[PDB]
Amino acid sequence: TDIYAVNGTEILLPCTFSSAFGFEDLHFRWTYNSSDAFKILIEGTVKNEKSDPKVTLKDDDRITLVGSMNNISIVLRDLEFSDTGKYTCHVKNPKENNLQHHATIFLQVVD
């Protein structure tokens, strides 16, 4: 679904997971898709349900993890019109052979 944000401001793009019985070695990835580009924005690991995420890839310095729920939300600051597009959070649980794709967020940056 759609979120609107003003050029030059910041926006929080949310991602929460929950685990019935915890987890080990969770991996996450946020992606961006536009009509002509794809970007892996940030990737990381979470050792278990009692650990903080560890970022292993960040390709834009305007992105930060929000910090903790079972939360891998990101804040994107200093928005530009080219930031308009589709943002998707993906969570992989190798041990459970599980991969969840959260609903794509269409961010529209406006003047």
Pair type for strands 24-33 and 105-110 = unpaired
Reported as half-sphere exposure (CB side, CA atoms, 13 A), residue 44 has a value of: 21
**At 96, which amino acid appears?**
E
Are 6 and 79 in contact by the 8 Å Cβ rule? The answer is yes
Domain residue ranges in the chain: 1-111
Pair type for strands 105-110 and 2-6 = parallel
Experimental method: X-ray
User: For residues 41-54, b (16+ Cβ closer than 10 Å) or e, as one string?
Assistant: bbbbebeeeeeebe
3-state SS, residue 95: helix
Q: How far apart are CA 77 and CA 100, in angstroms?
A: 26
| Reduced 3-state DSSP string for 14-38 | CCECCCCCCCEEEEEEEEEECCCCE
Q: How far apart are CA 31 and CA 104, in angstroms?
A: 10
Are 103 and 15 in contact by the 8 Å Cβ rule? The answer is no
Resolution in Å, one decimal place: 1.7
Q: How far apart are CA 76 and CA 3, in angstroms?
A: 13
Fold of 1-111: Immunoglobulin-like (2.60.40)
